[PDB]
Design a protein around this nucleic acid. Structure first.
Lengths: 692, 126
DNA sequence: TTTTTTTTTTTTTTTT
């Protein structure tokens, strides 16, 4: 009948025994989720992975949610095991969940992941109805839940509800006190009366679920609510977060009752609000645990709000690029404008935990006050629905952005970062949610005027955008690398490329001589050489996803899904999609295949030089040298004219070849960005060839 | 000019939500007088003090009588807020318990004995 | 980061 049924019937009566399936039939992956790997023995020297995965392989007849043996998590770290792929299970085992009444669970123990399936059916029935329970939960554990596939700060699954609506709680005889009242009297108040607070800042989710400790929904969010003049950092615990997080927005008047008051956490950093007149109560913090009756948190509509009392309004610090030009090192600010660039979902390993990762994506916000965008570093703000789907041609507003500057290098690094309390939103056509702000009105007027002028901005999506520009002073580049082996070995590049996980980024420096360079037109000589080694690396491959693509609104879902994070569950294509190549490339000049000879003439490597500067840059000398990959603007050409009377990109080609030819035997320290685009595809691109 | 004048006008202009004095200058206490605390809820678990005091500061230009917050009654219980000592207010409100107002002291930093206490400064409010 | 339930409080004014 089906492979699933046959294997399950073959292995049902032998729990915790590994049997090769009687028949090996390719099965389509229809979903891949990630959850904590508790209940495993942490006594083994190779501590089992902090997370395990569940894969919903689907046969022609049924699809039965299986369990991936944690030893196979390598196939998911590299994204080799993705949704829509065909794999051939080689080893299976049966495990029974002792905290649930149900049938056996198939335990995948060895796979041979192949390629994307030709036909994926999302309507195949579920063999075991238990797997079809609407509040989807992991196969193992009693009250477990699925986390987001890659990062841990993004809500995922059905445990996250959005059903909360305003409620009209009568204030007839409700004892409401002020935050300062608790501040002065919270160690003597046996009972803590009700409160009427308003949200000012909502923080990003935080998962504190360790594998050994037994916790349910280890989710914790810090909300800076302010009742009257006072403000405290309320913190929701346990399973309260996945019942109120997707519903509570900044500016909702909450009525908190049956709460707890304690001492401020020692490592807590309460953010200063926009208004300085308020009192920042930083000695005690209100903890909201899930009380049996659902009266602890009640939100009252604005109509029920009474100006008779004083409630701190939600203010903002909207700033333009011109203002940012003078803003100091660290000054939290809000930004708004028309998105003009979207990066990829890069992942940086957390120092706190080498297993967890962040999910950031470089974006550019355009305005009328400057010719450069804000260049925001957008981390995951626990808003996957917006974060993943943002595209250039739209209005984007991000709040609580911290300035970051670096004058050590000539191209001042004036960019922003997303703090813990940073939120993301896409404003309406007129800017309805933020229309009240004056800067918002100015931005809307600018967009309307420019559109009425028949003008469009150069919109780019995804690509290879290493925003951080390596300085021109190799000494400063080394200084930034404090005893971290700034110059990676010529033979270690293989291992470093083998260490990156899905969409991981890392910057290293190599020492060598320019073996040769062949110009690759994006579409005056075409090739040149400088002139038997121990071994050579063939890493000069530029993938189609690496080339930035001009944005076309007609095809926006396709473009946004080609640079997003890999989906957890399958979604059939809505028709026959286009091809990424048919979209024009935002780059104005082609790449190169610079080959590097080792200093000892024993190891060689092939790397790709993908410059971002336009011919306008090499004419105006906005770049550092002809061997750099980023221009001082670090912004894709504004297309003020599209094509100018300047030396054509074909002329800049050949010119770069001869510029490299100048560095015939010169000892150089090139900075080579290395990233793993997914599957086994890995990119190694040049950034800057430091020369003496 | 006069510190009390500036504080009064500031709390009148900006919302009177325990306005923090924009500028803090040492002020000399000229009198501390007590009376019963009538017209109070007296229903909070931490029952309010039975008596309250009305300090009489002097900034060198005018002397204004200010109603001390009952929360700061310990400073007068311990004789830390006496005549002569020059203090520094840090919070101020504008109570109406109305004609003009009642400059309230919500916080204070009692200092050292003053050497220039003047009994000649006229009352700003008659 | 986690973390719940319970209560305790005595005393000198008004007459119209």
């Amino acid at each position: 009948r089906s492979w699933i049924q046959k294997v399950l019937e073959q292995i049902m009566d032998s729990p915790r025994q590994c049997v090769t399936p009687s028949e090996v039939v390719p099965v389509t992956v229809l979903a891949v989720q990630r959850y904590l790997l508790e209940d495993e023995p942490r006594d083994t020297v190779p501590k089992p992975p902090l997370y395990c995965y569940d894969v919903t392989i689907s046969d022609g007849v049924y699809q039965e949610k299986c369990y991936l043996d944690p030893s196979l998590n390598s196939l998911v770290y590299q994204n080799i095991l993705k949704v829509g792929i065909q794999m051939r299970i080689s080893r299976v085992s049966c495990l029974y969940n002792e905290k649930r009444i149900g049938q056996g669970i198939l335990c995948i123990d060895n796979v041979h992941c192949g390629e994307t399936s030709d036909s994926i059916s999302l309507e195949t029935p579920f063999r075991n109805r238990a797997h079809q329970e609407k509040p989807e939960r992991p196969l193992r554990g009693g009250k477990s839940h699925y986390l987001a596939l890659w990062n841990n700060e993004d809500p995922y699954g059905d445990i996250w509800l959005t059903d909360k609506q305003p409620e009209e709680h009568n204030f007839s005889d409700t004892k409401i006190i002020s935050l300062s009242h608790l501040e002065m009297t919270w160690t003597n108040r046996r009972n803590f009366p009700a409160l009427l607070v308003r949200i000012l800042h909502k923080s990003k989710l935080r998962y504190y679920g360790k594998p050994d400790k037994k916790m349910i929904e280890p989710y914790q969010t810090f909300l800076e609510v302010a009742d009257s003049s006072g403000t405290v950092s309320v913190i929701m615990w346990n399973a309260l977060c996945p019942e109120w997080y997707k519903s509570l927005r900044v500016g909702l008047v909450l009525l908190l009752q049956d709460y707890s008051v304690k001492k401020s956490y020692p490592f807590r950093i309460q953010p200063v609000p926009v208004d300085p007149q308020i009192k920042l109560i930083s000695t005690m913090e209100i903890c909201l645990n899930l009380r049996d009756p659902p009266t602890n948190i009640i939100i009252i509509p604005e109509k029920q709000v009474k100006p008779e009392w004083r409630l701190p309004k939600l203010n903002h610090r909207f700033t333009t690029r011109s203002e940012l030009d003078d803003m100091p090192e660290n000054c939290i600010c809000d930004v708004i404008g028309l998105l003009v660039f979207v990066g990829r979902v890069q992942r940086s390993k957390k120092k706190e935990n080498r297993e967890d990762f962040w999910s950031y994506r470089w974006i550019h916000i355009a305005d009328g006050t400057s010719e450069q965008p804000f260049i925001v570093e957008l981390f995951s703000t626990s808003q996957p629905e917006i974060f993943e789907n943002i595209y250039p041609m739209a209005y984007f507003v991000c709040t609580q952005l911290k300035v970051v500057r670096n004058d050590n290098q000539v191209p001042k690094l004036l960019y922003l970062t997303t703090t813990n309390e940073s939120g993301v939103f896409i404003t309406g056509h007129r800017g309805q949610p933020y229309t009240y702000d004056a800067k918002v009105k100015n931005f809307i007027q600018w967009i309307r005027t420019k559109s009425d002028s028949g003008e469009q901005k150069n919109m780019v999506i995804g690509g290879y955008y290493p925003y951080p520009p390596v300085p021109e002073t190799f000494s400063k580049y080394s200084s930034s690398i404090k005893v971290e082996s700034l110059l990676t070995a010529i033979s270690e590049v293989r291992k470093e490329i083998e260490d990156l996980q899905y969409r991981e980024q890392k910057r290293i420096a190599i020492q060598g001589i320019i073996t040769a360079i062949k110009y690759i037109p994006h579409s005056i000589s075409d090739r040149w050489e400088s002139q038997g080694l121990i071994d050579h690396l063939h890493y000069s491959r530029v993938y189609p996803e690496s080339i930035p693509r001009k944005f076309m609104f007609e095809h926006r879902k396709f473009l946004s899904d080609q640079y997003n994070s890999q989906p957890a569950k399958y979604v059939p294509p809505e028709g026959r999609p286009p091809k990424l190549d048919d979209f024009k490339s935002a780059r104005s000049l082609g790449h190169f295949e610079v080959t590097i000879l080792g200093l000892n003439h024993e190891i060689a490597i092939d790397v790709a030089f993908l410059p971002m500067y336009c011919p306008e840059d090499i004419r105006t000398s906005q770049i550092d040298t002809l061997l750099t990959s980023m221009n001082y603007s670090c912004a894709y050409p504004q297309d003020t004219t599209g094509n100018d009377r300047l030396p054509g990109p074909r002329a800049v080609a050949g010119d770069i070849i001869k510029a490299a030819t100048e560095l015939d035997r010169v000892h150089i320290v090139g900075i080579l960005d290395i990233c793993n685009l997914g599957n086994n595809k890995v990119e190694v691109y040049l950034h800057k060839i430091y020369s003496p």
